[PDB]
Design a binder for this molecule. Structure first.
Ligand SMILES: *[C@@H](c1ccccn1)c1ccc2cccnc2c1O
Ligand SMILES: *[C@@H](c1ccccn1)c1ccc2cccnc2c1O
Ligand SMILES: *[C@@H](c1ccccn1)c1ccc2cccnc2c1O
Lengths: 117, 118, 114
């Protein structure tokens, strides 16, 4: 699993511990070992939501499996909660694109996760 | 709808009201209220297009529906037009990836846009 | 084809020639003319991989076709090879998302490739 957050919130406002909290919470949420989890935070972005330059975020979560209706609503509650508490971004100014990646379409360590054929 | 532009054009070359213009134009183009539209511009990027570092852009438009052959051609004419006029990027050095997102796969406001089933 | 690499490796550590080597190797690997190839490198990123902030990379390759099981394994060997040699990133700290794009969903020059 990998989570990316792009935000107009200033770098200075990103608290110590943020990447590690994302990593651990996502491991728990996805039921996957933390060794697998990648996180990427991009502050100071030139972006608008609803035409307003108030704090907002555009995010993505890629996962091989564990993507779907109820699971995604749970990820959204978790991730919006963290963005609100840690970056002071209103949940209704966040978009998260979820991608259910096929194992054959994810590269890692000189190969992919399709090892069967 | 959300539109992202990554470009090697300098931050100083990005017009002041550029984000607002994109928001309004995309609202009109998508038929959606501006309150839904998100825009994101990333200048000063290290990029090459065709092996050259002349001004270029790599973009994406995500939308739940309203994505398809004819519509995408219309989006491309609109968005390339804006990038050329405002950022002075030639249309043949722009790529735009279009994504038709399922409502269940777009998160917003503590949930997603799949509110119908459990 | 277009390739994006986001990494926490410092800008100064990106060698002269890197974008051009990526362009050339991707042209060769995808079979597409180098005039098509777009490459984008984003250094100095705030990232963690497995909870650690040692060098890592999150990448994507979008292509109209030329995406598939064996082809993607070959792209991964090629691209991880380059990231290891040029940016000193361990291949096991790299993820690459592959996208097989429909030509109608790729805009260019005021239109699409459909
Ligand atoms: C998460 C992930 C999904 C897509 C792109 C990057 N990361 C992830 C990472 C590693 C494995 C290994 C085996 C099975 N599943 C995953 C996975 O979902
Ligand atoms: C645009 C959009 C699509 C995908 C990801 C982010 N933004 C968008 C936003 C909100 C709604 C709500 C209801 C129906 N459609 C959309 C929509 O296309
Ligand atoms: C590579 C590509 C794929 C998706 C998005 C951006 N670039 C690429 C570029 C142009 C053409 C034209 C005709 C056929 N195929 C491609 C292509 O794979």
């Amino acid at each position: 699993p990998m989570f990316i957050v792009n935000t107009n919130v200033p770098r200075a406002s990103v608290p110590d511990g943020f990447l590690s909290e994302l990593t651990q919470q996502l491991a728990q949420a996805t039921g996957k070992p933390p060794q697998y989890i990648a996180v990427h935070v991009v502050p100071d972005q030139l972006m608008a939501f609803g035409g307003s330059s108030e704090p907002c975020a555009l995010c993505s979560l890629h996962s091989i499996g564990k993507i779907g209706g109820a699971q995604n609503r749970s990820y959204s509650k978790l991730l919006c909660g963290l963005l609100a508490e840690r970056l002071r971004i209103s949940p209704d100014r966040v978009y998260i694109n979820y991608y259910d990646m096929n194992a054959a379409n994810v590269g890692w360590n000189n190969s992919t996760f399709a090892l069967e054929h």
